[PDB]
Amino acid sequence: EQGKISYTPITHESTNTSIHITDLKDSLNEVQYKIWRTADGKERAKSFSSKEKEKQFTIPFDIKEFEGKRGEFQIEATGMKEDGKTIPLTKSIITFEQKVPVLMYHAIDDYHGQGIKDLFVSPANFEAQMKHLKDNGYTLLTFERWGDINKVNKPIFVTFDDGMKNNMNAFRVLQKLKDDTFKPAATEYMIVDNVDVEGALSTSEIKEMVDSGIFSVQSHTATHADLPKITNYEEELKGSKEKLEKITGKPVIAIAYPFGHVDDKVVTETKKYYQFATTTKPGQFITKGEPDELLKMKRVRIHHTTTVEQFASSIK
């Protein structure tokens, strides 16, 4: 191989770059760049040609060429020599960060006054919302697959706060929609000291959820503590993690801050035991390389009266 692909640096806001190639030994009348998204696969590659040696075979690359789809792009360069032969040159990777909606659900039930109205999404609505994700080719992830957000199409994280029994309704809907094409996954943030108490998930229910492969069960602290206000951080953060890990049989790496209450101190303590933390601040996540950004993740709130159309717009 003879290589060194170079491109102009990008940020999370970039939509274009300039790609050229240097350190060539052979003389070429043409170089082809084959470019494809890892999520789509080699079969959906698009090709670009440059016959300009003096400009180091520069090409403009813009994601409008892929209908504004972002993520990881693989670049494969080949050249045609002066003797008619086509040779391999080199390969490279460029990654346009994609946005990641993190959905916040709480209770999945019809409302009978059994809590905060806005926190209840009906089974019919929930099914409609999940079917919209299925039909439009969203890839439902959990935090164990964080490394894949730029390698899949339309990544999204469905999350549930508290560990309510009615989240078994969500489990049944997700099971029912599963098939060869659609592999649902979701994250449940459990109040760990509520395991096996009335109205909360039992140990056997949690185990069924995890064993199915659909749910990743993660921390919501031990007692749903107001984190900025307490000092028993080891107990609420590390203790909830460890207790929950023996229930699930799988690592606990994520937390949701109760009440959405967080400050610099809470982040400092959380970082000792968790890799990912979600707030209740509205918005979609994108990787910017800001300090501790994985521990201050925004979420998209779904409301009692949210229609599929409102839902769809909130995640685009």
Ligand SMILES: [Zn+2]
């Ligand atoms: Zn909560």
